Ligand binder design. Structure first.
Ligand SMILES: COc1ccc(Cl)cc1C(=O)NCCc1ccc(S(=O)(=O)NC(=O)NC2CCCCC2)cc1
Ligand SMILES: Nc1ncnc2c1ncn2[C@@H]1O[C@H](COP(=O)(O)OP(=O)(O)OP(=O)(O)O)[C@@H](O)[C@H]1O
Ligand SMILES: Nc1ncnc2c1ncn2[C@@H]1O[C@H](COP(=O)(O)OP(=O)(O)OP(=O)(O)O)[C@@H](O)[C@H]1O
Lengths: 564, 283, 321, 321
């Protein structure tokens, strides 16, 4: 533990004597005990999955209140990594090695992963006579860190005592997650006379074989699509058929989503409100995940700034950056996957509603209504999270850009303000040329149908050349429309490529030429650069979002018309 | 064989395009390189402004010009080749197999192929630039880079297979829905007096569900590939940061490396997605 | 065309929606015995290692609480002698559970707790050895290895014997040791429909062994010809000599039970015969020859069958005429 | 309305006036094996503790008789070295029975008695370990845990098959491992009266399994439909389609015997069906489906039965007409 003979001079001095290095060895105990008690159990399960796992693809349940279990494990792993960093920083005196000041924490990290894979295996097959060890392990670890924290307060200095604050944080962490499984005890009550717990709808959902079993898995899959992995190998092996593809789960019905939509109707001020009352709860989760992904994205160039600061506290910023990127990406995907689900269920329920309106009629336009505007809804809903999120990313990027650069932040701000309505303008003229191209394409294809059906009669008279000349005429009109497309596509790609050049150039040059008191360290410059790499995506996505909301008003206007 | 598109394109505009794309990408690389040699007053800043002028629209205009060339050449060629063919080939084949090609394939070629090839090539050269710069800063990064490239190759293959299958199946799935829909409107009073509308409610439910599970899988697949591609990007962020700070223990090389380590996560996604889409749309 | 059970038994059936209640793991010992040898070894290696290690940490800590480790002074008396590092403590743990007791590290009377820990560790380690032995014994009794020594001809033939159309199959045993109370059961797997419209996907029909006394036992020393005479009560009474083999998709399940004379463990030899594995109009070639002093079996002639003139009709048609 | 045996077997019968002769405890080992694990552990923990302790007192006393403990003088030679307190003596006892022999405490040649005590303690402790192991082994062979893996549908139906009214019941096995020589027995518990006025409170009637060869064995891999065809010899020949269920209070006992392929231990799966657990005019829904490569069993459809048109009369009346 130490340099001289003090590790014993703890207990050489009388009584408890508050036992400074000893409480770290007390914290060793829970973690080491856990791994060892559960290794024998975990191993048999591992061997059984290797031996017979066809039965394992048949059985699935979730213990009550388990999502918070997952996320508390994630953030306790986060803080454990932080205290590993604190332990290495404390050993950085390096007069001798101090194993007991960072290894105990490392064992906790190892213990934590086991403590959650063990939970995954008891959640895999229900055997509630098995988390007894789990809760006694949590209360024992809570007691040991409680002793550590109160002796820290016995030798306190207060606020900037970093390990003190971190320690009490994970103390109340283990206490609250300890309360989670006694809530599970309160639910199932297996030590007194009963446990009648069983899921039918995922189990009866499983009856058809292949599944889109995402709504019931561990939250690991719910971030990473672990379930999908198994499914793809088959597609690489054998081809894919509709029968092989799944059938949607109990809540995923056009009937069920339509039923909740009918509940919403039963409850400008009508249809829109019903849709929100029907899907608002599902949607705001994606929004929240997107907001958190924005914050974790902005954590990036901050880490770059700190790293190039200290290279003019290093690996710790890299590890925190690593965790930030993982959670960011995952959060973005979570937002993406919820936006989609909402879109889909909206499409099914709205198609059912349109159909029932047709069934209550006591037509190519109606086909256009469904085939266009419902798809527009599906798409608009995906990009619905961005309506308020886009303002956040841009504004907080501006704020950090000012706190880095001073006056030159308004240069790149001017660049992006010049960016966005140009995209809007080109999209407008693109849509005009789309309508022109649709007119010419309808002419050419209809004339082509008449020519191909009467192509025998043209073969009788050798009259193919005249109508191929007609084809050529309508084709040249199409080429006029396609040159308009060429113009507008080239100007869009030139914007989306050359704007990040001009922003960086004029920002740094106006910074340095504006005042010779500039200081172009790489920590300033590259953090601002990676901010500029972030902030292209929101604008280029926001122009389409704006056009999508115009189309959204149109879709609700036409559906309001038809449902009249 | 995708090279038939190239033969319809002509070698000259190919040379213009590839040389201009490599030009502007190496210009971007050189901008960041002389930025690093800056930060570790009129001289190199005036060099940077002179560099930043060079990036230009010529790759975009070259792509669009080339697409117009390929469109008119393939249109005239297939028109003349088909009108050369006898009536017997029209009689044995269905006319729908011709007209569906005439509509769908021409609209594909003239709307979606050129821009998506441009963005695929752009993302390709961007990830090449990022890996090149990160390897230039950290030379021993390549040992960590190699098995991650192997894993990206495997994921890439699996995704492309599953994505082609789901995409084609979704496109086939959505069509009998609107077919049944148009029929159901056209014989509305017939079904009402038949009083068979519960049956066709059920059939629309089946079609709708099918379109859903097809779309859900496609969305799920896209997410899975996208999620994995980012984990690997975060890993190379970590490894590049560790190696750079370990060696540093100059600043500018490390900062450029971390910037491109950020960008590579989006680069992988964009490349894979555009690769699978073009592997479909060159059919 | 999926087979119920393979040529080597190893029944191939998936089991969907098991409502697992955890009984799968409660039966820890049947499971442990079921495990392959490499995993049985890993578990017990791990169990010992963990048990030795978990306790070792406790021993190290008790040394620490007493504070005996760094003073190294004579006046103070340690609870566990010669304890300088965790490593020394670990080795002590090993010496206790596997009862080595080298002696360089001894337990004193200072810690009434150390005495208690010693009692607990001895007992725990003791119980582990007891359980470990029990598991190993049952594994050494896995007589299924003898099941692999049992032979079933790849294909079974249909030929008339004593004027009656019958189903024949050859079976043998490669080991000198016998299988006592060897019993043979034969079932026919057929998707069948009753007149009430009831449908069964895998209906199993019992098939008589034509045993002279109506028994199912057989003293199998030399390869034997097991057969079933097709009559009015046999499900094969309507077999078509040509279509029964390919267009119909039936399966004959042959079960050979009995106990190994050496262990007393009951085992099973499982095999199956699909429609295309049955031959019509062929019989088995004699296997047993005779030396001047003994009887000899030529196992290379097991699958040897020859074509013999036979009626080409269903057993029913044969009886009708 | 008391059940003979529960849905999960676990027969519920009280036994009054047992004239216990003490045979209950003479059978110590069947009893020990019968004990729950926590009690088996307590007994052996206690046995060791006591054995270690009982002998330890003797060791301490022999030290005392010799008088070697308090002189601590070199000239005198102790019988057991390093014996200062009872605690030291106790630790010595431990080191002897579990064969640790740390060495700080050794036996000298002074006490010919100590030598004898050593012999006795080693042997006693030795025999204890032998018995303890034997007990543990039999416990690890408690195959009743496999009995819990056997499934019986909650209710059995009465439907006609091949024109004959029959009793149907579904049975299955959740484990991959098989049960050899699986035999099924079915008994009907009915308070019955003969014509001689004799009354029986729980008369058990044997029920045939409609086995094709008259056997009671069954190769159960996939869930099977066990049934009994009601005839002139069946006690269900006079079942009323409506009153048999509630006003009559009969019970069907279903016994599934067989040996676990892994242990060789014979087990039983016991279940029962009261009158109100039987359905009339219903049959079982098919469980087994088929994948391109294998057969699949949907266990969630075990209790799934559907109503089918059926005669609503007794089997006798059905035959009379
Ligand atoms: C991906 O650009 C963005 C960049 C930045 C931002 Cl802040 C948002 C987005 C964005 O896109 N927000 C919409 C969410 C979204 C859209 C497409 C995709 S996807 O990967 O193309 N998968 C599919 O589209 N599946 C289809 C979708 C239509 C129904 C049938 C299945 C995945 C998610
Ligand atoms: N109530 C009982 N509980 C346990 N064992 C009994 C009981 N009653 C008798 N036995 C033992 O089993 C046998 C049962 O026979 P039975 O009850 O006919 O005895 P018995 O004819 O009354 O003669 P005994 O007076 O010896 O019991 C008896 O010989 C007795 O040894
Ligand atoms: N799918 C299954 N996998 C494993 N065990 C099952 C399964 N289904 C039922 N069991 C157990 O075996 C018995 C089979 O009977 P059955 O399937 O009829 O149950 P049930 O009548 O549906 O009543 P329950 O709702 O309790 O299953 C049930 O009582 C249940 O305890």
């Amino acid at each position: 533990c130490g340099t001289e003979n003090h590790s014993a001079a703890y207990r050489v001095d009388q009584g408890v004597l508050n036992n400074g290095c000893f409480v770290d060895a007390l914290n060793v105990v829970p973690h080491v005990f856990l791994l060892f008690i559960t290794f024998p159990i975990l191993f048999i399960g591992w061997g059984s999955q290797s031996s017979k796992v066809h039965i394992h693809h048949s059985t699935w349940l979730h213990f009550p209140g388990h999502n918070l279990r997952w996320i508390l494990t994630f953030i306790l792993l986060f803080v454990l990594v932080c205290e590993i960093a604190e332990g290495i920083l404390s050993d950085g005196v390096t007069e001798s090695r101090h194993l007991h000041l960072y290894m105990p924490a490392g064992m906790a990290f190892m213990a934590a992963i086991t403590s959650v894979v063990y939970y995954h295996n008891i959640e895999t097959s229900n055997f509630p006579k098995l988390l007894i060890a789990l809760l006694i392990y949590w209360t024992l670890a809570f007691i040991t860190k409680t002793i550590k924290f109160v002796k820290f307060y016995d030798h306190a200095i207060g606020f900037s005592q970093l390990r003190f604050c971190l320690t009490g944080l994970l103390v109340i962490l283990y206490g609250m997650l300890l309360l989670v499984e006694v809530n599970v005890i309160r639910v199932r009550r297996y030590i007194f006379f009963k446990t009648p717990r069983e899921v039918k709808p995922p189990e009866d959902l499983q009856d058809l074989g292949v599944r889109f079993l995402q709504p019931f898995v561990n939250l690991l899959s719910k971030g990473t699509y672990w379930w999908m992995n198994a499914f793809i190998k088959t597609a690489h092996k054998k081809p894919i058929d509709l029968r092989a593809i799944a059938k949607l789960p109990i809540a995923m019905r056009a009937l069920t989503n339509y039923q909740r939509l009918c509940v919403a109707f039963d409850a400008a001020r009508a249809i829109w409100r019903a849709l929100c009352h029907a899907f608002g709860r599902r949607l705001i989760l994606s929004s929240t995940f997107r907001i958190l992904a924005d914050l974790l994205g902005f954590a990036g160039p901050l880490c770059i700034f700190g790293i190039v600061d200290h290279l003019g506290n290093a690996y710790v910023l890299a590890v925190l950056l690593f965790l930030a990127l993982l959670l960011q990406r995952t959060f973005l995907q979570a937002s993406y996957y919820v936006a989609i689900e909402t879109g889909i269920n909206l499409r099914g329920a709205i198609q059912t509603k349109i159909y029932n309106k047709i069934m209550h009629m006591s037509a190519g336009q109606i086909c256009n209504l469904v085939a266009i505007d419902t798809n527009q809804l599906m798409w608009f809903f995906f990009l619905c999270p961005n309506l308020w999120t886009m303002p956040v990313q841009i504004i907080v990027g501006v704020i950090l850009l000012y706190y880095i650069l001073g006056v030159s932040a308004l240069i790149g701000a001017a660049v992006i303000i010049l960016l966005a309505p140009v995209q809007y303008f080109v999209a407008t003229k693109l849509s005009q040329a789309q309508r022109t191209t649709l007119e010419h394409s309808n002419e050419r294809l209809k004339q082509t149908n008449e020519m191909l059906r009467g192509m025998k009669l043209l073969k009788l008279y050798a009259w193919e050349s005249i109508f191929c000349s007609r084809v050529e005429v309508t084709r040249r009109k199409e080429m006029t429309s396609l040159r308009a497309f060429a113009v507008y596509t080239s100007i869009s790609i030139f914007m989306n490529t050359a704007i990040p050049i001009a922003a960086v150039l004029i920002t740094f040059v106006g910074h340095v030429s504006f005042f010779k008191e500039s200081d172009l360290s790489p920590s300033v410059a590259f953090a601002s650069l990676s901010l500029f790499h972030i902030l292209v995506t929101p604008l280029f996505l926001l122009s389409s979002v704006v056009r999508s909301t115009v189309k959204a008003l149109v879709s609700v206007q036409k559906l309001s018309e038809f449902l009249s | 064989a995708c090279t038939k598109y190239l033969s319809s394109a002509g070698i000259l505009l190919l040379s213009l395009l590839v040389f201009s794309q490599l030009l502007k990408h190496m210009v971007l690389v050189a901008i960041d390189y002389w930025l690093a040699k800056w930060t570790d007053y009129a001289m190199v800043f005036t060099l940077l402004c002179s560099l930043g002028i060079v990036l230009c629209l010529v790759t975009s205009v070259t792509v669009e010009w080339t697409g117009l060339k390929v469109a008119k050449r393939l249109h005239r060629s297939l028109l003349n080749r088909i009108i050369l063919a006898p009536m017997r080939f029209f009689e044995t084949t269905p006319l729908g197999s011709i007209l569906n090609r005439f509509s769908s394939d021409c609209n594909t070629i003239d709307q979606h192929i050129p821009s998506t090839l441009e963005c695929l090539s752009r993302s390709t050269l961007l990830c090449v630039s990022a890996l090149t710069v990160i390897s230039y800063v950290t030379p021993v990064f390549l040992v960590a880079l190699l098995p991650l490239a192997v894993v990206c190759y495997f994921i890439q293959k699996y995704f492309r297979v599953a994505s082609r299958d789901l995409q084609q199946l979704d496109d086939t799935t959505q069509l009998p829905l609107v077919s049944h829909f148009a029929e159901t409107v056209e014989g509305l009073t017939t079904i009402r007096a038949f009083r068979y509308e519960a049956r066709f409610q059920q059939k629309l439910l089946e079609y709708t569900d099918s379109n859903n599970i097809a779309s859900l899988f496609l969305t799920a697949a896209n997410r899975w590939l996208e999620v994995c591609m980012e984990y690997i990007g975060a890993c190379v962020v970590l490894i590049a940061a560790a190696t750079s700070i370990s060696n540093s223990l100059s600043a500018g090389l490390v900062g450029l490396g971390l910037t491109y380590a950020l960008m590579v996560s989006n680069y992988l996604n964009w490349m894979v997605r555009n690769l699978a889409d073009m592997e479909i749309q060159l059919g | 065309r999926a087979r119920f059970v393979s040529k080597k038994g190893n029944c191939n059936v998936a089991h969907k929606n098991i409502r697992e209640q955890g009984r799968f793991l409660q039966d820890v010992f049947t499971t442990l015995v079921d495990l392959k040898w490499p995993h049985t070894l890993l578990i017990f290696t791990m169990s010992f290692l963990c048990s030795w290690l978990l306790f070792a940490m406790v021993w190290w800590l008790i040394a620490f609480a007493h504070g005996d480790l760094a003073p190294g002074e004579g006046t103070n008396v340690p609870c566990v002698t010669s304890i300088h590092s965790f490593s020394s403590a670990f080795l002590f743990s090993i010496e206790v559970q596997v009862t080595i007791g080298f002696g360089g590290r001894m337990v004193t009377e200072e810690c009434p707790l150390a005495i208690l820990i010693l009692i607990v560790q001895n007992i725990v380690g003791l119980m582990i050895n007891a359980i470990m032995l029990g598991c190993i014994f049952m594994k050494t009794a896995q007589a299924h290895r003898r099941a692999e020594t049992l032979i079933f001809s790849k294909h079974a033939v249909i030929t008339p014997r004593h004027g009656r159309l019958c189903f024949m199959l050859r079976v043998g045993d490669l080991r000198k040791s016998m299988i006592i109370s060897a019993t043979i059961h034969m079932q026919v797997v057929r998707k069948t429909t009753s007149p009430e419209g009831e449908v069964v996907p895998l209906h199993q029909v019992d098939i008589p062994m034509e045993n002279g006394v109506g028994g199912n036992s057989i003293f199998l020393v030399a390869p034997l010809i097991i057969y079933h005479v097709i009559d009015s009560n046999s499900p094969l009474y309507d077999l078509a000599p040509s279509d029964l083999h390919h267009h119909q998709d039936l399966e004959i399940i042959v079960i050979l039970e009995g106990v190994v004379e050496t262990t007393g463990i009951t085992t099973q030899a499982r095999t199956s015969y699909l429609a295309d594995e049955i031959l019509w109009g062929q019989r088995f070639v004699p296997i047993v020859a005779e030396e001047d002093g003994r009887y000899s079996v030529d196992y290379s002639k097991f699958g040897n069958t020859v074509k013999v003139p036979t009626p080409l009709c269903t057993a029913r048609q044969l009886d009708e005429d």
